[PDB]
Amino acid sequence: XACXXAXX
DNA sequence: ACACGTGT
DNA sequence: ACACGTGT
Ligand SMILES: *C(=O)c1nc2ccccc2cc1O
Ligand SMILES: *C(=O)c1nc2ccccc2cc1O
């Protein structure tokens, strides 16, 4: 759920 | 059980 | 070495 490198 | 990678 | 959780 978070996006810090991908954002799922 | 499956779904994540770029940005220091 | 540190930096992540919402949504099926
Ligand atoms: C988002 O909350 C979240 N995203 C994920 C992406 C890929 C793998 C695990 C994973 C867990 C969570 O909680
Ligand atoms: C992004 O590429 C990315 N983000 C993260 C966030 C939190 C923890 C690990 C992590 C690894 C990567 O690759």
PDB file of C-alpha atoms (C1' of nucleotides) and ligand atoms in Angstrom:
ATOM      1  CA  UNK A   1       0.000   0.000   0.000  1.00  0.00           C
ATOM      2  CA  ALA A   2       2.750   2.709   0.568  1.00  0.00           C
ATOM      3  CA  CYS A   3       4.859   4.401  -2.247  1.00  0.00           C
ATOM      4  CA  UNK A   4       8.371   5.125  -1.132  1.00  0.00           C
ATOM      5  CA  UNK A   5      10.403   3.056  -4.890  1.00  0.00           C
ATOM      6  CA  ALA A   6       7.043   1.521  -6.166  1.00  0.00           C
ATOM      7  CA  UNK A   7       3.444   2.381  -4.918  1.00  0.00           C
ATOM      8  CA  UNK A   8       1.125  -0.523  -4.637  1.00  0.00           C
TER       9      UNK A   8
ATOM     10  C1'  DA B   1      -2.099 -15.855  -0.717  1.00  0.00           C
ATOM     11  C1'  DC B   2      -0.512 -11.773  -4.030  1.00  0.00           C
ATOM     12  C1'  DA B   3       1.290  -7.115  -4.748  1.00  0.00           C
ATOM     13  C1'  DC B   4       6.671  -3.109  -4.546  1.00  0.00           C
ATOM     14  C1'  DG B   5      10.828  -0.858  -6.583  1.00  0.00           C
ATOM     15  C1'  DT B   6      13.726   3.978  -6.874  1.00  0.00           C
ATOM     16  C1'  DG B   7      16.412   7.099  -4.063  1.00  0.00           C
ATOM     17  C1'  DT B   8      19.061   8.173  -1.153  1.00  0.00           C
TER      18       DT B   8
ATOM     19  C1'  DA C   1      22.455   0.799   5.407  1.00  0.00           C
ATOM     20  C1'  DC C   2      17.398   2.957   5.525  1.00  0.00           C
ATOM     21  C1'  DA C   3      13.038   3.607   3.465  1.00  0.00           C
ATOM     22  C1'  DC C   4       6.881   0.756   3.074  1.00  0.00           C
ATOM     23  C1'  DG C   5       1.831  -0.045   3.989  1.00  0.00           C
ATOM     24  C1'  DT C   6      -3.530  -0.806   2.219  1.00  0.00           C
ATOM     25  C1'  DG C   7      -6.399  -3.744  -0.824  1.00  0.00           C
ATOM     26  C1'  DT C   8      -7.862  -7.238  -2.532  1.00  0.00           C
TER      27       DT C   8
HETATM   28  C1  LIG D   1       0.828  -2.062   1.063  1.00  0.00           C
HETATM   29  O1  LIG D   1       0.280  -1.841   2.146  1.00  0.00           O
HETATM   30  C2  LIG D   1       1.568  -3.242   0.943  1.00  0.00           C
HETATM   31  N1  LIG D   1       2.141  -3.461  -0.252  1.00  0.00           N
HETATM   32  C3  LIG D   1       2.887  -4.540  -0.494  1.00  0.00           C
HETATM   33  C4  LIG D   1       3.410  -4.637  -1.779  1.00  0.00           C
HETATM   34  C5  LIG D   1       4.196  -5.747  -2.088  1.00  0.00           C
HETATM   35  C6  LIG D   1       4.436  -6.725  -1.115  1.00  0.00           C
HETATM   36  C7  LIG D   1       3.892  -6.603   0.175  1.00  0.00           C
HETATM   37  C8  LIG D   1       3.094  -5.499   0.517  1.00  0.00           C
HETATM   38  C9  LIG D   1       2.516  -5.298   1.752  1.00  0.00           C
HETATM   39  C10 LIG D   1       1.759  -4.182   1.963  1.00  0.00           C
HETATM   40  O2  LIG D   1       1.183  -3.976   3.206  1.00  0.00           O
HETATM   41  C1  LIG D   2      11.580   1.242  -3.712  1.00  0.00           C
HETATM   42  O1  LIG D   2      12.195   0.850  -4.704  1.00  0.00           O
HETATM   43  C2  LIG D   2      11.810   0.577  -2.504  1.00  0.00           C
HETATM   44  N1  LIG D   2      11.139   1.043  -1.441  1.00  0.00           N
HETATM   45  C3  LIG D   2      11.265   0.504  -0.235  1.00  0.00           C
HETATM   46  C4  LIG D   2      10.516   1.105   0.765  1.00  0.00           C
HETATM   47  C5  LIG D   2      10.617   0.574   2.057  1.00  0.00           C
HETATM   48  C6  LIG D   2      11.454  -0.523   2.304  1.00  0.00           C
HETATM   49  C7  LIG D   2      12.200  -1.101   1.268  1.00  0.00           C
HETATM   50  C8  LIG D   2      12.124  -0.591  -0.034  1.00  0.00           C
HETATM   51  C9  LIG D   2      12.823  -1.093  -1.102  1.00  0.00           C
HETATM   52  C10 LIG D   2      12.670  -0.515  -2.329  1.00  0.00           C
HETATM   53  O2  LIG D   2      13.368  -1.036  -3.403  1.00  0.00           O
END
